[PDB]
């Protein structure tokens, strides 16, 4: 019911179209994405509670990503997140 199988297959086809994903690897990456999402969400919750704010906006979940993914990969992930948020915001063309 709650999984990420089709999206994992889609990403793999986008990057390495010649390959295919096994059931065990699908389960491992499903758990991996769930764990990373839980970690980022709980760090953003800690950040929100730290400044007496009860909402978890894009700022909180970006600071949590920067704080929990140090190094080059963190900067790349933050760039990707800002690009996605900006792309969503360009639908304000109304």
């Amino acid at each position: 019911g709650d999984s990420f199988a089709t999206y994992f297959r889609r990403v793999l086809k986008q990057v390495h179209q010649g390959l295919s994903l096994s059931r065990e690897a699908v389960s491992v990456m499903d758990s991996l994405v769930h764990d990373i999402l839980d970690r980022i969400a709980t760090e953003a919750g800690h950040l929100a509670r730290s400044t007496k704010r009860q909402t978890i906006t894009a700022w909180e979940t970006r600071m949590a990503v920067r704080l929990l993914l140090p190094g080059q990969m963190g900067k790349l992930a933050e760039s990707e997140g800002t690009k996605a948020v900006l792309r969503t915001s360009l639908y304000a063309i109304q």
Partner: protein, 99 residues
């Protein structure tokens, strides 16, 4: 187009990530940008991990990604290893180091 995954150009589902954030009960209210940012971050993470695992599979002359290739991708790279150091992958094995 429609939906929020296609609106931001993300393969990962924004709505599902929003639902997971709501169900986990991490804060009273979840802003609009949080699911979009988290979906983008997770999509990039899984893209990097899948690319590394596929490269490991190609170096092994294997066309199917099993957990062993995932562990090779996680441990060989010097950064995902830091992020996933205390994580054991079932049937993942260990890298050949021979001291």
């Amino acid at each position: 187009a429609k939906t929020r995954s296609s609106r931001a150009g993300l393969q990962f589902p924004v709505g599902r990530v929003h639902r997971l954030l709501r169900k986990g009960n991490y804060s009273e209210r979840v802003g609009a940008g949080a699911p979009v940012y988290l979906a983008a971050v997770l999509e990039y993470l899984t893209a990097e991990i899948l690319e590394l695992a596929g490269n490991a599979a190609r170096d092994n002359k294997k066309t199917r990604i099993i957990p062993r290739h995932l562990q090779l991708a996680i441990r060989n790279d010097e950064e995902l290893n830091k992020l996933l150091g205390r994580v054991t992958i079932a049937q993942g094995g260990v890298l050949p180091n021979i001291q």
